[PDB]
């Protein structure tokens, strides 16, 4: 940027905001992404200052512009979680956008932010009424996403499933046999939450996580479940079993149920697609050290799906 | 709409499709999932074999030294030339870093390899990508037919209000229209 070394960052940011206002097409996102980089990474002390000017674009007619705003909210809260106090309302209204792509993007963002806010709540020594109300908002938004399992849009259902997956993992304890993705090493989980915490109740969360799981198992036996929703769910159950092996029992039961009762609304090629994924996820749970207690059952399913004996052995220890 | 077309050797089915889509204004990349590049030879049990690091031009040059006549007759020199004008070498899907809306595979073995590989990458984003298979035989004719069927499919997908909500329905219509089966799944970034 010519004479960029002579600028204050706040001047650069104002210039760029006014430039973005001048642009009447999606190339404005390029500009707005420069602004994001500046006030989130280069000089985060300028975040609050300029927040409203970026959030104002939430009412742009462009789909992509609104998706960029959601992305910005995610990164802003990651940099300084206290901004959730004034951004949880914006995010929830974006969750109710008329365009499904914007809704799906808000769901993915909540998949990232629910666990960051919960850590915020847990690390806090003292909590304002405003902070309590923010947790209530986050928490009821989670419930709203769970209810999107019953949306009439297949893509919104898929995204809800991934949010529910994340929630179940967050709301249950890591154990000795958990396989934890490296990206997620420092994510909060149940065991991390003090039993005597002043505001967050361990047993409440535990019951909410189990109830999110039961919701998921219910949804998987819904009689019109789509090909894609069912494969998304089967994959999530495999993630859940690998990261939270106390549920492996539940997952194997789900797979047994599904194998014996394929939803009959699936077209021929959908049945095939689903069976291939069931096999794939079964092998995957097999490889997990905790599958020892389920090994005969998993083997029997695998044989019924035509898995060769040598392919089964290949996925043992 | 960002599409990836994936075959086994990244020589014939994927490049034919790469070519059509690209000329028709799509954003498209192509790959192969096979262990090595395979190319027809002087008998069906005598294919030529290469590494994925080998260039299209090196293959051409190799083939022209071996049997100029044969590799002109069977269209392979022409294919390599066509490939070279697209990009300098075949790419393994397993080494790619890129994001797509839609990934089309050209046979079931390939579809399995695409799914196996994406299912073993750690998801950071949970964004879905749709993976769809159509069986296309590995010869020039079918490759070309297959490219146009893929083109029509993508053009259709570009005309729907809501890709994710309509795609299964489109695929079942394409099944009825072509008598070819279309497997379909999602993976996650």
Swiss-Prot record, chain A:
HEAT repeats lie at residues 8-41, 44-78, 81-123, 130-169, 204-243. It comes from the Eukaryota. It is found in: Cytoplasm, Cytoskeleton; Cell junction, Tight junction; Cell membrane; Cell junction. In testis, expressed in polar epithelia and Sertoli cells but not in vascular endothelia. The protein is detected in stomach, duodenum, pancreas, liver, fetal brain, carcinomas, lens-forming cells, fibroblasts, lymphocytes, lymphoma cells, erythroleukemia cells but not in endothelium of vessels, epidermis, intercalated disks, Purkinje fiber cells of the heart and lymph node. Residues 7-101 are annotated as: Interaction with HSF1. Scaffold protein that functions as a component of a multimolecular complex involved in histone mRNA 3'-end processing. Specific component of the tight junction (TJ) plaque, but might not be an exclusively junctional component. May have a house-keeping rule. Is involved in pre-mRNA polyadenylation. Enhances SSU72 phosphatase activity. The HEAT repeats have been determined based on 3D-structure analysis of the D.melanogaster ortholog and are not detected by sequence-based prediction programs. Could be used as a differentiation marker in the differential diagnosis of tumors. Found in a heat-sensitive complex at least composed of several cleavage and polyadenylation specific and cleavage stimulation factors. Interacts with CPSF2, CPSF3 and CSTF2. Interacts (via N-terminus) with HSF1; this interaction is direct and occurs upon heat shock. Interacts with SSU72. Belongs to the Symplekin family. This is Symplekin. It comes from Homo sapiens. The gene is SYMPK. The chain holds residues 30 to 340 of 1274 of the full protein.
From Swiss-Prot, chain B:
Pfam families: Ssu72. GO terms for cellular component: cytosol; mRNA cleavage and polyadenylation specificity factor complex; nucleoplasm. Transmembrane segments: none annotated. InterPro entries: RNA_pol_II_suA. GO terms for molecular function: RNA polymerase II CTD heptapeptide repeat phosphatase activity. It is found in: Nucleus; Cytoplasm. Keywords: Coiled coil, Cytoplasm, Hydrolase, mRNA processing, Nucleus, Protein phosphatase. Its EC number is 3.1.3.16. Residues 155-181 form a coiled coil. GO terms for biological process: co-transcriptional mRNA 3'-end processing, cleavage and polyadenylation pathway; termination of RNA polymerase II transcription. Gene3D superfamilies: 3.40.50.2300. It is an enzyme of class 3 (hydrolase). The keyword NADP does not apply. Its main location: nucleus. It catalyses: O-phospho-L-seryl-[protein] + H2O = L-seryl-[protein] + phosphate; O-phospho-L-threonyl-[protein] + H2O = L-threonyl-[protein] + phosphate. Interacts with GTF2B (via C-terminus); this interaction is inhibited by SYMPK. Interacts with RB1. Interacts with CD226. Interacts with SYMPK. Belongs to the SSU72 phosphatase family. Protein phosphatase that catalyzes the dephosphorylation of the C-terminal domain of RNA polymerase II. Plays a role in RNA processing and termination. Plays a role in pre-mRNA polyadenylation via its interaction with SYMPK. This is RNA polymerase II subunit A C-terminal domain phosphatase SSU72. It comes from Homo sapiens.
């Amino acid at each position: 940027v010519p004479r960029g070394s002579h600028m204050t960052t706040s001047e650069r940011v104002v210039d760029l905001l006014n430039q973005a206002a001048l642009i009447t097409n999606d190339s404005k996102i390029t500009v707005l992404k420069q602004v994001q980089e500046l006030i989130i990474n280069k000089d985060p002390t300028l975040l609050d200052n300029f927040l409203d000017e970026i959030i104002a674009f939430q009412a742009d007619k462009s789909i992509e512009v609104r998706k960029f705003v959601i992305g910005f909210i995610e990164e802003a809260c990651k940099r300084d979680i206290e901004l959730l106090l004034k951004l949880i309302a914006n995010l929830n209204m974006l969750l109710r956008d008329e365009n499904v792509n914007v809704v799906k993007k808000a769901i993915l963002t909540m998949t990232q932010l629910y666990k960051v806010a919960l850590q915020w709540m847990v690390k806090s020594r003292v909590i304002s009424e405003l902070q309590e109300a923010c947790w209530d908002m986050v928490s009821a938004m989670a419930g709203d996403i769970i209810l999107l399992l019953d949306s009439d849009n297949d893509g919104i259902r898929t995204h809800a499933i991934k949010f529910v997956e994340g929630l179940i993992v967050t709301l249950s304890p890591r154990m000795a046999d958990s396989e934890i993705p490296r990206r997620q090493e420092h994510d909060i989980s149940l065991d991390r939450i003090p039993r005597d915490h002043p505001y967050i109740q361990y047993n409440v969360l535990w019951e909410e996580g189990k109830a999110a799981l039961e919701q998921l198992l219910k949804f998987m036996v819904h009689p019109a479940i789509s090909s894609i929703n069912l494969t998304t769910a089967l994959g999530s159950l495999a993630n859940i079993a690998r990261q939270r092996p106390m549920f492996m029992s539940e997952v194997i039961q789900a797979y047994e149920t599904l194998h014996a009762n394929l939803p009959p609304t699936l077209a021929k090629s959908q049945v095939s697609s689903v069976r291939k994924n069931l096999k794939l996820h079964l092998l995957s749970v097999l490889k997990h050290p905790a599958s020892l207690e389920f090994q005969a059952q998993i083997t029997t399913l695998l044989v019924d799906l035509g898995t060769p004996q040598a392919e089964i052995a290949r996925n043992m220890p | 709409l960002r599409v990836a077309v994936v075959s086994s050797s990244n020589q014939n089915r994927s490049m034919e499709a790469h070519n059509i889509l690209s000329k028709r204004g799509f954003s498209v990349r192509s790959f192969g999932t096979g262990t090595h590049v395979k190319l027809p030879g002087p008998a069906p049990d005598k294919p030529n074999v290469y590494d994925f690091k080998t260039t299209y031009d090196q293959m051409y040059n190799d083939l022209l030294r071996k049997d100029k006549e044969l590799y002109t007759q069977n269209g392979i020199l022409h294919m390599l030339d066509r490939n070279k004008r697209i990009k300098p070498r075949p790419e393994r899907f397993q080494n790619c870093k890129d994001l797509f809306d839609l990934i089309l595979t050209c046979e079931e073995r390939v579809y399995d390899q695409v799914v196996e590989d994406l299912n073993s990458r750690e998801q950071e984003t949970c964004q879905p990508v749709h993976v769809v298979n159509v069986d296309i035989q590995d010869n020039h004719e079918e490759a070309t037919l297959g490219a146009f069927l893929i083109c029509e499919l993508c053009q259709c997908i570009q005309h729907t209000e809501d890709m994710e909500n309509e795609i299964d329905e489109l695929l079942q219509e394409f099944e009825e229209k072509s008598g070819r089966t279309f497997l379909h799944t999602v993976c996650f970034y």
